Design a protein around this nucleic acid. Structure first.
Ligand code: MG
Ligand code: MG
Ligand code: MG
Ligand code: MG
Ligand code: MG
Ligand code: MG
Ligand code: MG
Ligand code: MG
Ligand code: MG
Ligand code: MG
Ligand code: MG
Ligand code: MG
Ligand code: MG
Ligand code: MG
Ligand code: MG
Ligand code: MG
Ligand code: MG
Ligand code: MG
Lengths: 109, 191, 139, 50, 175
RNA sequence: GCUGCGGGAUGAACCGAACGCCGGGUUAAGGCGCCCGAUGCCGACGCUCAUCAGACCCCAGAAAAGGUGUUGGUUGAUAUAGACAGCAGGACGGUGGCCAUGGAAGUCGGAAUCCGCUAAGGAGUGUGUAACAACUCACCUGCCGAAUCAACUAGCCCUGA
RNA sequence: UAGCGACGUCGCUUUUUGAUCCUUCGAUGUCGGCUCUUCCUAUCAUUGUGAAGCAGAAUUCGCCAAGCGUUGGAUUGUUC
């Protein structure tokens, strides 16, 4: 809130996003309408092991990875990005099986 | 601070066809035609677009009051375009205590005649506006629906009804009786 | 409506003041009420004049914003404002008003004799044509 | 007596703000008496319930 | 000051008289906006008497000169620091004006402080005049004039009361 | 007083200016819509609308206080890491945590109060079922597009009258 | 803060009384009542309204408002 404070306000999310920036290929673009019930733990618990799911404000994330990129690629997740409640489980695992488990595995399952 | 050229953007849909002869605006649509006179307002009116029908409302210089004025033309043109497509519909549930209220439409939808109104003997004959119809609606207890084109005329009629039903010399936190506007909407639904 | 609004580089006439009858070109607007004008060939030096002083007309140019006398003169000569100015009815009206002020008595004598001859020819041919219109509408 | 219709009638005649200086009925969100007879004060009070 | 006509900028330098207690006084310099050099010489003593131990019999005014405008054909943006004195108490003020010359800007300042806050030519002290660059003007009027491709017409322009005869059959077509 | 004259309509004392009788010219204090001589200036800049406007030393009626009426100004706080209100989503869990067993499963009352998940949830601002429950607020995220919010001050006008 | 409101504080009024002596001492007939006309509003009632600790009634407090009313008597010369 004074920018970074070295506390958990603003530039700790802009430490986590930009320090969990050098461990992955494949942001996955999970989005749910409401998570107010135990759906939060239904997001994390079933996908644990590799449990991530971290993205704050998409308004925060406009010029964020642009200005603190130094990663060239993966900025082609551009303006198709902002819109929609997106949670971003950026992963490092095998193929589409992640999305397959989520193709339903939190809200009715 | 003597600003410059504030401009409002009024989209026009495909069905309605607009035509202005000055500050007098004449709009045609499926549900009749309509017109107003914006003579006393002194604002540039102009339209642009071959069959896209964009309207811009533009006022130069001015004051802060006149920058407040330039949005009101936009909002009235919006309401006229909503009316000439759809038309406005006011749904009024009559709220009655131990006494009922009888409401009849006396002649041709225009005249509304209210009776028995807390046991008052005085028959209350209220004359509505030209260009608006009134009907006692079906499938609902004492709901009264006013339908018309010009929203000023229709809502002036609704105000005339609710100020015809007004309780004198009592508490008005008790004696909650009258005919009140419950819902504002369109003639054709889902639009 | 409002066909002619001011701009960077629109020519203008100066009606009342120390420069009556002289074209200027508008360089830029200072603040709402005066503006900097300049005339390269119409003999008027770069200065700030009010808007109610100046009279607007319809020719424009292409200036950079706040250019020099040089580029104003270049666009002036390349657009040929003076000849095209004299070839409009507005300047014909101004020219006629100046000639009417600069008449003399012998000129007014010739004007009245030509005026009588013209109005007599008009009167005869108008009376004949409206008599012929009556004779046309008579059947 | 229909409590939803009671909510409607109380919406039209009860939940208003009353100014202490001009005594005029205004609006539930309003801050200022619009009348000239007091002069646009910010001195209000809620309308009393039963 | 009466601020009559149009203002003029004077550069005025002056010093105390040399005493045996102090040879060569520091010879100060100010920038006075005045209708003429006499009002400039008096207003110079008025400021320097507030700032340092000086008065008109104590010292001398060495040079008093007109400051010709360094860039007259340019349209400049001026910031003025005002120390007007109201009925209740004195204040500070930062005003902005878009105008040609410094003298015209200070004239617009006096006229606008006469018009808005009813402050006469008594109470106004001009602290500092600074030609400020574009895009740092705080005020919204000068900010909205900061545009190229500026367009406006001249709406409802009416004029010439009785420049015609007082009686005519024309009724004027304003625009 | 002992003193006219030009202005302040009107006056002893005010502001100019003091007196023989006259012709020309110039001004002072004041004033220049018409009474009434002069702005019949293509005057310069802004402010204010009054349902009791305002209009010139002496002077022939007004204050304390208030105004999201407008116009400036000061000091802070937010806004590109997207505020501001508007539309849309939620508003948990260890945990029916704890005082109670009159309810209380955050909602009359009491002590308190940590942590996790996160986008954030206040061991929960309240709506309302006597209570269980939907529901909102605090807090959070999308569409949005450039200024916004909070105090304070003084000019005109309005209330006070 | 519906209605009041101390401690303080800013005004208005000339229907109380007081202060002053500016006008008249070669005279302005001095109290009260009877009658009679008009005006003000700082509204007691009536018309139209809003707010109440306004359920109804009866009240209280405000606003536009002076059009129209505001009496009969015992006492005292009385105003009161
Ligand atoms: Mg009652
Ligand atoms: Mg004597
Ligand atoms: Mg003497
Ligand atoms: Mg004398
Ligand atoms: Mg006299
Ligand atoms: Mg007078
Ligand atoms: Mg006299
Ligand atoms: Mg003489
Ligand atoms: Mg004079
Ligand atoms: Mg005259
Ligand atoms: Mg104010
Ligand atoms: Mg006043
Ligand atoms: Mg005496
Ligand atoms: Mg006496
Ligand atoms: Mg006598
Ligand atoms: Mg006598
Ligand atoms: Mg007598
Ligand atoms: Mg009367």
């Amino acid at each position: 809130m004074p920018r970074e404070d070295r506390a958990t306000w603003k530039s700790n999310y802009f430490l986590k996003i930009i320090q969990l920036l050098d461990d992955y290929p494949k942001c996955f673009i999970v989005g749910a309408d409401n998570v107010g019930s135990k759906q939060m733990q239904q997001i994390r618990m079933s996908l644990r092991g590799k449990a991530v799911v971290l993205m704050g404000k998409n308004t925060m994330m406009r010029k964020a990875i642009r200005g603190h990129l130094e990663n060239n690629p993966a900025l082609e997740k551009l303006l198709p990005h902002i819109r929609g409640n997106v949670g971003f489980v950026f992963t490092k695992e095998d193929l589409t099986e992640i999305r397959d488990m989520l193709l339903a595995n939190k809200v009715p399952a | 601070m003597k600003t410059i050229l504030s401009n409002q953007t009024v989209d026009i849909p495909e069905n309605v066809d607009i035509t202005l002869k000055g500050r007098t605006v004449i709009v045609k649509g499926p549900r009749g035609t309509l017109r107003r006179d914006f003579n006393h307002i002194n604002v540039e009116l102009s339209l642009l677009g071959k069959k896209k029908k964009r309207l811009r409302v533009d006022k130069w210089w001015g004051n802060r009051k006149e920058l407040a004025t330039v949005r009101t033309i936009c909002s009235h043109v919006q309401n006229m375009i909503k009316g000439v497509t759809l038309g406005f519909r006011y749904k009024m549930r009559s709220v009655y205590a131990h006494f009922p209220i009888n409401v009849v439409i006396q002649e041709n939808g225009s005249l509304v005649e209210i009776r028995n109104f807390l046991g008052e003997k005085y028959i209350r004959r209220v004359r509505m506006r030209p260009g608006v119809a009134c009907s006692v609606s079906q499938a609902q207890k004492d709901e009264l629906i006013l339908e018309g084109n010009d929203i000023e005329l229709v809502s002036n009629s609704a105000a005339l009804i609710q100020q015809a039903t007004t309780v004198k010399n009592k508490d008005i936190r008790k004696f909650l009786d009258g005919i009140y506007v419950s819902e504002k909407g369109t003639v054709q639904q889902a639009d | 409506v409002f066909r002619r609004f001011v701009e960077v580089g629109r020519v203008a006439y100066v009606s009342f003041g120390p420069h009556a009858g002289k074209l200027v070109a508008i360089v830029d607007v200072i603040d709402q009420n005066r503006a900097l004008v300049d005339g390269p060939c119409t003999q008027v030096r770069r200065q700030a004049m009010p808007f109610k002083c100046m009279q607007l007309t319809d020719f424009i140019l292409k200036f950079p914003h706040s250019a020099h006398q040089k580029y104003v003169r270049q666009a002036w000569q390349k657009a040929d404002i003076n000849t095209k100015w004299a070839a409009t009815r507005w300047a014909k009206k101004i020219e006629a008003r100046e000639r009417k002020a600069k008449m003399t008595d012998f000129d007014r004598f010739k004007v009245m004799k030509a005026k009588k001859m013209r109005n007599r020819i008009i009167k005869n041919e108008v009376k004949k044509l409206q008599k012929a219109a009556l004779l046309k509408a008579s059947p | 007596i229909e409590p939803s219709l009671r909510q409607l009638a109380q919406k039209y005649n009860c939940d208003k703000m009353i100014c202490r200086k001009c005594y005029a009925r205004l609006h539930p969100r309003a801050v200022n008496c619009r009348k000239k007879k007091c002069g646009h004060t910010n001195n209000l009070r809620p309308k009393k319930k039963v | 000051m009466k601020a009559s006509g149009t203002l003029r900028e004077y550069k005025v330098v002056g010093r105390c008289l040399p005493t045996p207690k102090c040879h060569t006084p520091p010879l100060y310099r100010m920038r006075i906006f005045a209708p003429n050099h006499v009002v400039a010489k008096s207003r110079f003593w008025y400021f320097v008497s507030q700032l340092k131990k000086m008065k008109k019999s104590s010292g001398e005014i060495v040079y008093c000169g007109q400051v010709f405008e360094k860039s007259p054909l340019r349209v400049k943006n001026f910031g003025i620091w005002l120390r007007y004195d109201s009925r209740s108490g004195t204040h500070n003020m930062y005003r902005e004006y878009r105008d040609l010359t410094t003298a015209g800007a200070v004239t617009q300042c006096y006229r606008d402080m006469g018009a808005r806050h009813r402050a006469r030519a008594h109470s106004i002290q001009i602290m500092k005049v600074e030609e400020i660059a574009a895009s740092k003007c705080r005020r919204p009027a000068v900010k909205q004039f900061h545009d190229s491709k500026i367009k406006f017409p001249l709406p409802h322009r009416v004029l010439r009361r009785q420049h015609k005869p007082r009686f005519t059959t024309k009724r004027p077509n304003t625009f």
